[PDB]
Amino acid sequence: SILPEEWLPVLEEGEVHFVRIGELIDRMMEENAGKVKREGETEVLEVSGLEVPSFNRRTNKAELKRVKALIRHDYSGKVYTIRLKSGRRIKITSGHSLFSVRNGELVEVTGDELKPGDLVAVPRRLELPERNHVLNLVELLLGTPEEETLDIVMTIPVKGKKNFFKGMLRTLRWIFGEEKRPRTARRYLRHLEDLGYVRLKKIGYEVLDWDSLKNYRRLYEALVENVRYNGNKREYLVEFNSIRDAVGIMPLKELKEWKIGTLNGFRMRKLIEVDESLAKLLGYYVSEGYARKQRNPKNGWSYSVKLYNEDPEVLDDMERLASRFFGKVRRGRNYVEIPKKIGYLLFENMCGVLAENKRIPEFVFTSPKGVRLAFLEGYFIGDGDVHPNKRLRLSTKSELLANQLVLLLNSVGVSAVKLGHDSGVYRVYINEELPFVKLDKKKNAYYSHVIPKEVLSEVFGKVFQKNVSPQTFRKMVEDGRLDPEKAQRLSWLIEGDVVLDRVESVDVEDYDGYVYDLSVEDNENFLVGFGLVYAHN
């Protein structure tokens, strides 16, 4: 079993969520009490919709699998904190298993069995789904405290909507039997068909969904009540807050036409398509970005987002990108600032405000590889990690980010990763090339680009000098230097997505409380812990 606190990367309906295994299972079992099957000391909860990364037991390749069920035991006994030389850490119960090596094969080894020096299975790479994501600023702001969207409004050109709200509301009420058939009934009746609520017909019409119509009605009832007129720009106006309990009902087909932001400030489309520019911009923010607000002249708040960076070219890039999204920007001395309120709200709810709350936005993880790399590039360039004298070194006061980074790197091939927590700050060491950073992976080759000498020694019989790289291994085989009959046993290790890290230290403790587990389809293994370590279910 795994301890409550352990990080668990999981996928829900194609989205990657980092959660502490215990919190997940706890909640899931509270909102599904009726479905739990208790067994004195064990509570099982079958689920669907959840997927976790695992490795194929046969081919050892990285693949996502279905999580059959969540499990919760009421444990009392010894727990082990396993610390791998790479900086990865995992807290498990005594009988829980991780994967080690025995005569060139991946075998299960329990916690109370593991000792320093032992080799443990860890990811070399991961395969996460790739799809285009579309940010919905309405759904974003709804999850924001009303205090923050006080001055936010949604405008819409009054042009092709001459009293559209009132005209529609009258049609809805007519359909509901509360008013005489309006004169413009058909204009709107068509729109309701376009939305699939009503199917027009020869004679009159037929309501296809009353519930949906009720909600739509509720929406237009709210709109007709709060929509104002902005004579200046010939546009309709609505304070976000006054319709927070109905706006989410607005079909996307209608949302497109609106704009969201401040009355006398910047306004942008409520539906943003994620591209490499957005990602990179977000990359810059996560690393060198800071969001703030001050009282300003008339006590009342002024929101801005600053992107610090000494390098002149960088500032030109951030400015080029920032402005590509938030119109007019303010290029400073050593920074680029976005004084827009909607810009602050976007960055805040996506990546966080405080350094320790900083995080990679959820959509990035399952975006096409190009977008992931764009995010990374922005993070690195901003964090000033382009020209390495040794190896890339990223710092974060945010534990989540450290983990999210390792997953992102893993998801795009980077396996040479090391972790560290020297003083309140988390470090992520990367010792291998990146499409945007020239560095030598062969220089001080990490555990990931090396085959342990213990494994070779045990398989071939000889006593190997030192560690060997997968390349040298392949070559020795094509030389007769290594017996090809034995060298094949180790193929999984040269072709799979699992590498070996070595146990550095093991802490034994007594634990009284809840412990968790997962049942994973087929592979029966998944990723858990700081840095991600494959654990047997």
Side-chain angles (χ1 to χ4, degrees):
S1 304
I2 313 301
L3 281 261
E5 223 64 24
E6 297 313 333
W7 283 114
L8 176 77
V10 80
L11 284 102
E12 284 185 59
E13 310 309 332
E15 291 300 89
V16 163
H17 297 310
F18 254 94
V19 302
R20 296 176 178 294
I21 196 178
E23 301 188 4
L24 177 75
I25 297 196
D26 276 0
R27 199 182 67 244
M28 291 267 90
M29 293 193 145
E30 197 179 313
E31 323 177 327
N32 294 289
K35 298 175 161 187
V36 187
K37 284 287 181 170
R38 185 177 179 188
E39 285 188 295
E41 67 210 9
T42 307
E43 297 164 278
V44 181
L45 166 51
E46 298 193 295
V47 286
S48 65
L50 291 187
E51 272 174 347
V52 303
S54 61
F55 71 80
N56 184 290
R57 307 188 303 175
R58 292 181 46 269
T59 55
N60 290 239
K61 311 217 63 185
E63 49 186 36
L64 296 176
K65 280 309 193 191
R66 230 245 311 171
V67 179
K68 285 192 174 182
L70 304 189
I71 302 174
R72 184 170 68 180
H73 313 260
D74 174 56
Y75 193 76
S76 178
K78 301 194 306 279
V79 299
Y80 299 66
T81 300
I82 308 297
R83 320 199 128 96
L84 308 181
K85 253 187 170 187
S86 66
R88 292 188 172 75
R89 176 176 53 61
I90 183 173
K91 233 151 173 292
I92 60 178
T93 60
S94 43
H96 199 280
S97 310
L98 300 183
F99 306 91
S100 191
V101 184
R102 244 193 52 243
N103 293 304
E105 296 233 298
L106 254 200
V107 298
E108 298 174 37
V109 171
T110 57
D112 50 0
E113 230 170 293
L114 289 168
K115 65 193 191 304
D118 287 5
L119 291 172
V120 161
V122 130
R124 177 219 293 300
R125 54 139 53 255
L126 293 165
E127 291 283 304
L128 294 178
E130 269 158 282
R131 82 188 179 68
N132 299 308
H133 283 68
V134 179
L135 268 176
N136 181 327
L137 292 165
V138 171
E139 295 311 317
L140 205 68
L141 298 191
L142 284 171
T144 295
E146 299 178 296
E147 305 91 71
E148 283 192 295
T149 57
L150 284 176
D151 52 8
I152 295 294
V153 299
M154 286 182 75
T155 74
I156 192 175
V158 68
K159 307 299 86 176
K161 310 296 181 177
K162 345 82 206 311
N163 231 28
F164 178 73
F165 308 127
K166 271 164 64 178
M168 173 77 263
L169 183 50
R170 290 172 193 153
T171 312
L172 288 165
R173 298 196 43 168
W174 162 54
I175 289 179
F176 273 94
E178 295 178 49
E179 268 183 52
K180 55 178 182 179
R181 180 177 189 302
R183 11 60 194 57
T184 336
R186 234 69 181 189
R187 174 198 177 180
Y188 305 98
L189 279 177
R190 289 210 234 82
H191 188 180
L192 292 175
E193 179 179 57
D194 196 295
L195 298 180
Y197 298 157
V198 157
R199 184 206 66 179
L200 283 175
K201 53 187 297 175
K202 41 284 181 174
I203 182 279
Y205 73 73
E206 188 217 309
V207 171
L208 294 179
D209 195 347
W210 282 106
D211 282 313
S212 299
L213 253 179
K214 288 197 185 180
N215 296 313
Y216 193 71
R217 202 242 235 214
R218 197 155 68 68
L219 207 211
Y220 276 61
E221 230 134 44
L223 291 173
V224 168
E225 241 54 66
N226 302 279
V227 173
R228 221 181 303 159
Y229 191 80
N230 197 31
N232 285 313
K233 305 177 186 178
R234 328 157 182 177
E235 51 172 36
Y236 281 132
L237 182 87
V238 170
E239 279 168 52
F240 188 62
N241 285 1
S242 73
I243 65 165
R244 259 160 158 295
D245 62 301
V247 66
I249 294 175
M250 184 150 68
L252 295 183
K253 187 164 237 183
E254 297 197 1
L255 228 207
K256 298 184 304 185
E257 307 188 58
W258 296 72
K259 248 67 189 179
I260 187 175
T262 58
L263 185 64
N264 308 300
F266 188 60
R267 302 164 190 181
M268 63 190 302
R269 269 185 168 184
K270 20 70 274 304
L271 286 170
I272 297 169
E273 295 193 284
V274 180
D275 57 33
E276 283 144 41
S277 308
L278 223 208
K280 189 163 179 178
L281 206 204
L282 297 168
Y284 279 137
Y285 174 89
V286 183
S287 55
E288 292 302 301
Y290 304 78
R292 267 261 262 67
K293 46 194 259 186
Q294 51 176 54
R295 305 236 225 61
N296 246 193
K298 263 189 176 181
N299 267 282
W301 299 143
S302 186
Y303 305 72
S304 84
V305 186
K306 287 175 183 171
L307 307 183
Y308 299 149
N309 190 286
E310 308 297 307
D311 283 297
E313 355 75 289
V314 180
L315 287 177
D316 291 300
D317 193 35
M318 307 178 138
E319 192 199 303
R320 161 182 152 285
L321 290 176
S323 54
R324 174 188 253 97
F325 290 94
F326 311 91
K328 173 78 188 318
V329 172
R330 286 180 191 159
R331 172 73 128 87
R333 178 219 309 168
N334 63 312
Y335 60 62
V336 176
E337 160 170 291
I338 311 178
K340 289 72 182 308
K341 175 63 177 295
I342 191 71
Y344 167 88
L345 290 181
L346 194 166
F347 286 100
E348 173 194 63
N349 297 97
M350 291 230 86
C351 315
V353 172
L354 298 170
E356 54 278 2
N357 297 320
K358 238 66 181 295
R359 63 166 179 300
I360 299 179
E362 178 221 67
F363 69 74
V364 179
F365 304 96
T366 53
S367 284
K369 189 161 170 173
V371 179
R372 303 181 204 178
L373 283 177
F375 176 80
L376 282 179
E377 187 185 10
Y379 187 79
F380 286 52
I381 291 180
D383 199 303
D385 298 296
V386 180
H387 322 304
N389 302 293
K390 43 186 187 182
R391 74 286 163 168
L392 290 169
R393 183 182 198 146
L394 310 190
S395 306
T396 307
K397 291 182 187 165
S398 170
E399 196 191 6
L400 219 205
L401 215 206
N403 268 293
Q404 292 182 312
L405 280 168
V406 182
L407 189 86
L408 236 206
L409 294 170
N410 277 352
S411 76
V412 288
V414 176
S415 72
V417 183
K418 280 186 176 176
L419 295 169
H421 190 188
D422 58 27
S423 58
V425 174
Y426 295 86
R427 313 260 166 175
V428 180
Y429 301 95
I430 312 181
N431 184 21
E432 85 172 68
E433 202 194 11
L434 272 165
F436 52 79
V437 175
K438 267 208 170 188
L439 172 149
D440 190 53
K441 72 170 183 183
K442 304 170 182 295
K443 181 59 185 179
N444 295 295
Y446 280 177
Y447 61 89
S448 60
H449 300 292
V450 143
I451 314 296
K453 62 212 166 202
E454 307 88 70
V455 188
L456 289 177
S457 169
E458 188 172 61
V459 171
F460 297 104
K462 305 177 184 182
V463 180
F464 289 68
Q465 180 195 62
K466 54 166 187 174
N467 290 163
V468 181
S469 63
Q471 284 195 52
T472 296
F473 183 81
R474 284 195 184 73
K475 285 188 178 71
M476 296 185 113
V477 184
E478 234 71 12
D479 281 356
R481 296 169 72 184
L482 289 173
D483 168 21
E485 187 139 42
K486 298 181 179 186
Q488 183 202 36
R489 305 163 104 295
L490 297 175
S491 64
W492 62 271
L493 175 61
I494 278 58
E495 320 203 300
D497 301 314
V498 169
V499 294
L500 303 168
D501 191 21
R502 186 180 284 92
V503 175
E504 178 159 68
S505 68
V506 174
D507 300 355
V508 187
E509 221 164 272
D510 262 334
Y511 178 83
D512 232 78
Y514 274 150
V515 290
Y516 310 74
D517 257 293
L518 304 198
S519 196
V520 177
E521 213 180 68
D522 305 328
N523 304 320
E524 294 172 56
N525 72 235
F526 58 100
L527 291 178
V528 253
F530 187 55
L532 308 182
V533 178
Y534 275 108
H536 182 273
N537 75 170

